[PDB]
Amino acid sequence: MKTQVAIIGAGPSGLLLGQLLHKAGIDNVILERQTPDYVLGRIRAGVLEQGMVDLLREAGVDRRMARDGLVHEGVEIAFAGQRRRIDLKRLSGGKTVTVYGQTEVTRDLMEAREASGATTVYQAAEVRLHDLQGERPYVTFERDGERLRLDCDYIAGCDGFHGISRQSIPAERLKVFERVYPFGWLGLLADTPPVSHELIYANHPRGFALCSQRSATRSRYYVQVPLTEKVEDWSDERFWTELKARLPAEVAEKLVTGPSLEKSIAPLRSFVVEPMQHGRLFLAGDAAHIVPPTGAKGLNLAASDVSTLYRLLLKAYREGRGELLERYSAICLRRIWKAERFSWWMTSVLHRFPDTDAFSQRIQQTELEYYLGSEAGLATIAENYVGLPYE
Amino acid sequence: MKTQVAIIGAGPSGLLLGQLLHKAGIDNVILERQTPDYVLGRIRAGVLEQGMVDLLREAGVDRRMARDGLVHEGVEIAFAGQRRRIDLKRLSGGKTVTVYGQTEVTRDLMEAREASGATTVYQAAEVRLHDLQGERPYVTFERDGERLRLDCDYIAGCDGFHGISRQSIPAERLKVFERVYPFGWLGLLADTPPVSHELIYANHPRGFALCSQRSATRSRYYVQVPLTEKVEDWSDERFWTELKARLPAEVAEKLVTGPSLEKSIAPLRSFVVEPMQHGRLFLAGDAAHIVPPTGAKGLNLAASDVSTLYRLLLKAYREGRGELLERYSAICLRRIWKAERFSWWMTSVLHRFPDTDAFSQRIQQTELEYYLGSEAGLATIAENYVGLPYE
Ligand SMILES: Cc1cc2nc3c(=O)[nH]c(=O)nc-3n(C[C@H](O)[C@H](O)[C@H](O)COP(=O)(O)OP(=O)(O)OC[C@H]3O[C@@H](n4cnc5c(N)ncnc54)[C@H](O)[C@@H]3O)c2cc1C
Ligand SMILES: Cc1cc2nc3c(=O)[nH]c(=O)nc-3n(C[C@H](O)[C@H](O)[C@H](O)COP(=O)(O)OP(=O)(O)OC[C@H]3O[C@@H](n4cnc5c(N)ncnc54)[C@H](O)[C@@H]3O)c2cc1C
Ligand SMILES: O=C(O)c1ccc(O)cc1O
């Protein structure tokens, strides 16, 4: 088979790129290692920047989101007794964020794709990229036990952190930057009403906790935990008791608890690869960079890379300007580092780190006191949180 | 002899407190270990917050400063090729800083004191504090070889980091927070015209450099250096060559060099003691806390502690409200930690640290890019730099 753009990975990055391109006339084929169910079993993210909200509208897949998503105008930081609310709308100059599950976005995109009739190959094994630097690169894979070959002009590696794309670029061409945090997040999904109409990030001496939601009757909660913990050690009971111990008494007493639908530990990391492309291979989403979940930037950066890739591919195709694709990494990396800096900051001020001397404890507390107390301070949080402007 | 408030140390803290009190009718005696010349041989600081500028006016010692001091409305950060200017006046809402040597402030205060006839004992050896918790504490010292005793109601420890005051409080009552930086500043004073009308803080791969001034024909320059360097290894030649290598080419080529009047290495530290008082002993200035020089907060915090002490002593004396002196530490520490946080931030973004992995290099560079590029960002620098409001 042959196509124009081969897309490896059917996650939000891949499906979104595929929908944008297809809608513009550029044919694409998506290859996915797993089954649709497996992809749809991932809970993960739930906060979307306005820029991605508009990209979804542009991809023409927003009916359900415009209906079920929730528009939040403020978020709350709880520390040392107090609870401070950041007014995102007025501090950012009219911008807000939308709460709508990553699973929902994926479900919506998958629905739009199936209906469009565009090609999608699930259970495509042993994917391999070939001739990344020629005018005619190709992709090989196995479906059942047959080795197929797909010819294309470009390949978009949207296969996540453990994908085959990044591994296909000679190690000597890539420069890696990385930070691993000594803790993870134990998340829990429950069919109970959320404890607050907006999110609550809480810094507590026992560690970080996060009060989030997915809908009016569906909550998502997290608590920081050591990398040494295993999810089977944390029963629902233990989670609720632990969560309550880390929240403001007034919040803890309003909490409707319940049996978990899903529970899992996600470790924290920071990772950036430079550049994000090789020949006719362009990386997007987690294939190129990972951010700790604290600032909610993962899914959002995936969306911005894709927005950039889609728009450079449009020019190259319809306007015959293939020279523009060379600046892909430069454009994306400016936003990526800004988002990595913010995610890192949020993570350092809200989490309890092991082996922290007295001075750094005091500085972390004061960082909060200054930023949550100064108008200029709150503004740096707001503009970064709603999302910096797409360039 | 007997007095009302005994002041240990004739540095800016001690002289300023002494001038404020004397002007209000409260008698004080200053005890200084060294000679006036020795005190006047210290170059040190040169940047004053507006709040201290007004305190000097209030101490009635501002004629010379109002004449020779320089009012700056902006400062410059140089990094990775570019030079960014922070407009302090408009970003802070009309505030500015004044450049006037610490040596000048001291000289001015010493002049005002001598003329007032208020008591000052230089070369007062073996100072010892006694009965810190009784209604009648006292101070003993040696002048020549005679052991004298001075009776007072209160003692203000303004004797700096290596003073006797802090050592006089039982170790078990004090909680210490401390950070030592792996580098120092090699400063150099020259009788040459400054290279810029405003200050230039420069981050360079070889380390930090600072372009400052004292007057239109007197410059003060610094370069970060390892704690292992000795000032005799750095000849004027080497300093100038090194300074030039760290500055923007356009700035380096305008630099008028010359023989040094003074040269020295100041190490970097962060230190805070809690509380700042014991019985009838109140600590002020470097006796209670030290900040790295990056944010120019040392002399300025000394001034704010003193302003607070002076105003609580006024009430206790003329208004008979001695209960107010109990809240001295609480008031001072709010400003102190905010200033320590800022000084620490400035220091981490402008200096080159040893053993920094690739990720942190990238984050430091982006911190600069974000803060120097965002309006909210520049504003956090401006309001902190001109000085946060006295509470
Ligand atoms: C375990 C995990 C937990 C997360 N949790 C959070 C969280 O709690 N909150 C938050 O804000 N963010 C979270 N994130 C980040 C956010 O979910 C991701 O940024 C987002 O999923 C990235 O989108 P993507 O399309 O790049 O990658 P992914 O969603 O990972 O999709 C990549 C797709 O590629 C497919 N694939 C991989 N290898 C191959 C191959 N060789 N051949 C073919 N197909 C392949 C994978 O099966 C997958 O479908 C999480 C990410 C991960 C991985
Ligand atoms: C070496 C050094 C370099 C500095 N460099 C800079 C710089 O480059 N830029 C900048 O912005 N800031 C700098 N600072 C900080 C700033 O100069 C200080 O914050 C400021 O001097 C503090 O004022 P002070 O009155 O508390 O203490 P000091 O100026 O230290 O005065 C304390 C006084 O107490 C006297 N004394 C001490 N012990 C006794 C005793 N037991 N009995 C009697 N008298 C005693 C001392 O002789 C001294 O006169 C520097 C400080 C130091 C110590
Ligand atoms: O899942 C969420 O709802 C969520 C919300 C905010 C955040 O920072 C991280 C998260 O995973």
Ligand SMILES: O=C(O)c1ccc(O)cc1O
């Ligand atoms: O001495 C100066 O002029 C000076 C100026 C700014 C600063 O941060 C530190 C300093 O010592």
